[PDB]
């Protein structure tokens, strides 16, 4: 979160928190009412955000679901959508934490080692998160879509 790494920043520097750090912990907690509303929208829209998320993913990447693709059959396609439910969950954590620190140490650190070791095309799962982003930002206003989309594209950046 912004609270924990604004601390560990000033922790390492042998000092307390500046006004630049304490006027933002202050500014973040007054932002906390609006963050829970945004995460509350994505919380009980996972049925559509995931299922329509895998909608565009297969239309854009039919190789991964075609015979020979990693997510082929009734089995892998279920797990094919399971990971999108994971990453959609971590974005709800990042929105409430005000940072990608929850998304950092979960689903991002060493993610290329996992998916390379699973045979999954890491570029394909990046395409899946982008398809979820258009569904997510379509569910919110412009002021919110600059945030909810904002955490997806960070996940897109670290996932390639």
């Amino acid at each position: 979160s912004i609270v924990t790494k604004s601390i560990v920043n000033a922790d390492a520097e042998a000092r307390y928190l500046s006004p630049g750090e304490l006027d933002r912990i202050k500014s973040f907690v007054l932002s906390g009412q609006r963050r829970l509303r945004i995460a509350q929208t994505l919380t009980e829209n996972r049925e559509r955000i995931v299922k329509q998320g895998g909608q565009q993913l297969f239309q854009r990447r039919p190789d991964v679901v075609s015979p020979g693709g990693n997510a082929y059959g009734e089995e892998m396609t279920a797990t094919c959508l399971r990971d999108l439910d994971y990453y959609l969950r971590l974005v709800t954590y990042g929105i409430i934490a005000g940072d990608v620190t929850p998304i950092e140490e979960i689903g991002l650190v060493g993610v290329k080692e996992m998916y390379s070791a699973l045979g999954t095309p890491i570029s394909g799962v990046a395409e899946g998160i982008r398809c979820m982003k258009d569904v997510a930002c379509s569910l919110l206003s412009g002021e919110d879509a600059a945030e909810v989309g904002f955490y997806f594209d960070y996940t897109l950046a670290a996932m390639q």
Binding site: E105, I106, G110, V111, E113, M114, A117, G119
Partner: protein
């Protein structure tokens, strides 16, 4: 860190005697299998990622250590596994070439089971993974070479237990 030749020289040196017929008798036995070990270490270097991918999918891929709460849930924790399994398949390759498991306890076994208990890593699932990794290694290098590479896997599993 001794190979079969280093261990033979040490025991023959530690009594201050020369290399008699019994010391050279084992050394000739090691040189006979010298051709087998390199080809065994050859294919294992080639299929390092494929062997580890086969072991985890065959032993602990879908068990509930893989699911939330299990010991392998987060991506950092999953990525630590294949990093961790790489050492077992790698150091076992060194023991297979050196013909002596001294390198394992020198560089792998000591402080290992005492470390997994600290992190809370399940030793039971770890040995199963190495056992499954031993099973696929016998596929590649053959039977007798698998017997050689397999002889150091369970050495890790025994001491890690």
């Amino acid at each position: 860190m001794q190979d079969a030749i280093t261990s033979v020289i040490n025991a023959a040196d530690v009594q201050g005697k020369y290399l008699d017929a019994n010391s050279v008798e084992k050394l000739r036995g090691y040189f006979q299998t010298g051709e087998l070990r390199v080809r065994a270490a050859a294919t294992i270097a080639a299929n390092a990622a494929t062997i580890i991918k086969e072991a985890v999918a065959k032993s602990l891929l879908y068990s509930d250590i893989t699911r939330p709460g299990g010991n392998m849930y987060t991506t950092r924790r999953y990525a630590a596994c294949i990093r961790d399994l790489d050492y077992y398949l790698r150091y076992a390759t060194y023991g297979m070439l050196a013909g002596d498991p001294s390198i394992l306890d020198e560089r792998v076994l000591n402080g290992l089971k005492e470390t997994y208990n600290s992190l809370g890593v399940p030793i039971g699932a770890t040995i199963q993974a190495i056992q499954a990794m031993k099973e696929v290694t016998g596929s590649l290098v053959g039977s007798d070479a698998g017997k050689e590479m397999g002889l150091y896997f369970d050495y890790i599993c025994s001491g890690l237990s």
